[PDB]
């Protein structure tokens, strides 16, 4: 039985399993700051599950086998246009951020379902309260006009108020001249095109709005790169923390019923990601949306609700 | 003049405008509770005595 109001009436609670072991945490590091290494290192030793950074195609993993869908049918945008030419009228830049926003909604949403249905904490790579950092850095570098930006907070506030900040987070500190060397050292051709001021804008927003407003919702564990490669001290302090300050203790079972109810069904989770506000980077044409909505239909599995698509198996349909 | 100027002005557009014009005054209620219940009082009072629906 899926957790509905019936289970709570039966007595199904999640505060019983909500303990010190249910820490939903994520390493909010800079670009190529080794945050993924630090996050996974926490995962193996603290016993927490790992959530890879929800990309443009993580939602494709949430629905079906997980193969990245086509760009036009899984975002209408892609990352190479962001890095190569971050200035055009099509606005691939914000279409990335708007789509990438909803990916971390799900990544945190599935993080909830893990530790409210089992009580087992998770690890991620950044989270919902990190996407504004990129978007703020997006505006200062002249990427997409502020009309998208001011709509972003309106959407952000109405898709995260019901959402409870994580238990702790980790901020890996890597100097920005070194990061520009690091992105140049990797060799990804799209990484060459990145402006150096973008990386420090990420670093600035990390220590200007995220870290200050995060301090009262989770513990500050700002660790330098010299403090990041060693995988122990970054997790002993987590155990030696308190998990006292924050809204977690004052969330009784009725909040958790409200929480898991909303996050069990994604439809109202991102119902406010599709605000009736028409924007150049978001308003698909009536004909274009119509065919594209059709285009989503011929894809296998994406014709009926899951468990009913006879094209990809699902035998005994005449009884299901 | 006859068809496209007068006929559609002698029946469709006039009636459409009449509904258009005074649908506003019905629906442009500021929401003050004092004003709403004041209208209740007048309706209550004129229900009898004046209109004598009790007689």
């Amino acid at each position: 039985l899926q957790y509905g109001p019936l289970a709570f009436v039966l007595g199904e609670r999640t505060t019983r399993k909500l303990t010190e072991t249910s820490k939903v945490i994520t390493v909010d590091g800079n670009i190529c700051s080794g945050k993924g290494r630090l996050a996974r290192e926490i995962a193996e030793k603290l016993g927490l599950r790992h959530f890879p950074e929800a990309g443009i195609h993580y939602a494709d993993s949430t629905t079906g086998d997980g193969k990245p869908l086509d760009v036009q049918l899984s975002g209408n945008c892609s990352l190479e246009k962001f890095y190569d030419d971050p200035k055009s009228n099509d606005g691939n830049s914000y279409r990335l951020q708007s789509w990438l926003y909803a990916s971390r909604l799900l990544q945190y949403a599935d993080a909830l379902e893990h530790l409210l249905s089992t009580g087992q904490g998770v690890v991620l790579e950044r989270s919902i309260y990190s996407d504004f950092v990129f978007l703020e850095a997006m505006y200062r570098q002249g990427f997409i006009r502020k009309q998208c930006v001011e709509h972003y907070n309106e959407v952000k506030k109405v898709t995260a108020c019901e959402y409870l900040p994580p238990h702790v987070v980790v901020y890996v500190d890597v100097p920005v001249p070194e990061i520009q060397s690091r992105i140049q050292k990797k060799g990804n051709p799209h990484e060459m095109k990145i402006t150096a001021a973008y990386l420090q804008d990420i670093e600035n927003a990390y220590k200007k709005t995220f870290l200050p407003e995060m301090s009262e919702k989770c513990e500050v564990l700002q660790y330098s790169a010299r403090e990041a490669e060693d995988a122990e001290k970054v997790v002993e302090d987590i155990e030696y923390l308190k998990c006292d300050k924050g809204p977690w203790p004052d969330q009784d079972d009725r909040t958790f019923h409200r929480l898991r109810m909303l996050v069990q069904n994604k439809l109202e989770v991102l119902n406010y990601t599709t605000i009736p506000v028409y924007l150049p980077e978001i308003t698909i044409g009536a004909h274009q949306s119509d065919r594209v909505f059709q285009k989503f239909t011929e894809l296998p599995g994406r014709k009926y609700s899951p468990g009913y698509n006879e094209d990809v198996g699902d035998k005994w349909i005449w009884l299901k | 003049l006859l068809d496209l100027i007068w006929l559609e002005t002698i029946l469709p557009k006039t009636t459409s405008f009449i509904q258009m014009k005074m649908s506003i005054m019905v629906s442009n209620q500021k929401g003050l509770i004092k004003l709403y219940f004041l209208s209740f009082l007048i309706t209550i009072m004129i229900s009898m005595t004046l209109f004598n629906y009790h007689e």
């Binding site: 086998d65 296998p300 899951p306 468990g307 009913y308 698509n309 198996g313 005994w316 | -």
Partner: protein, 49 residues
């Protein structure tokens, strides 16, 4: 197979469906028996036969 997570209706609920045919036949033979006994209740109430 495509949906890696077990779909909410991945397999039939043999309790749920088995009830559905189980009740449906009940719904029929009740109506069938009721239709007969009403006919027998007819022909003697008015003395038709």
């Amino acid at each position: 197979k495509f949906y890696i997570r077990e779909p909410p209706h991945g397999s039939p609920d043999w309790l749920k469906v088995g009830l559905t045919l189980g009740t449906s036949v009940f719904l029929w033979i009740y109506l069938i028996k009721q239709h007969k006994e009403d006919v027998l209740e007819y022909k003697r109430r008015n003395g038709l036969e």
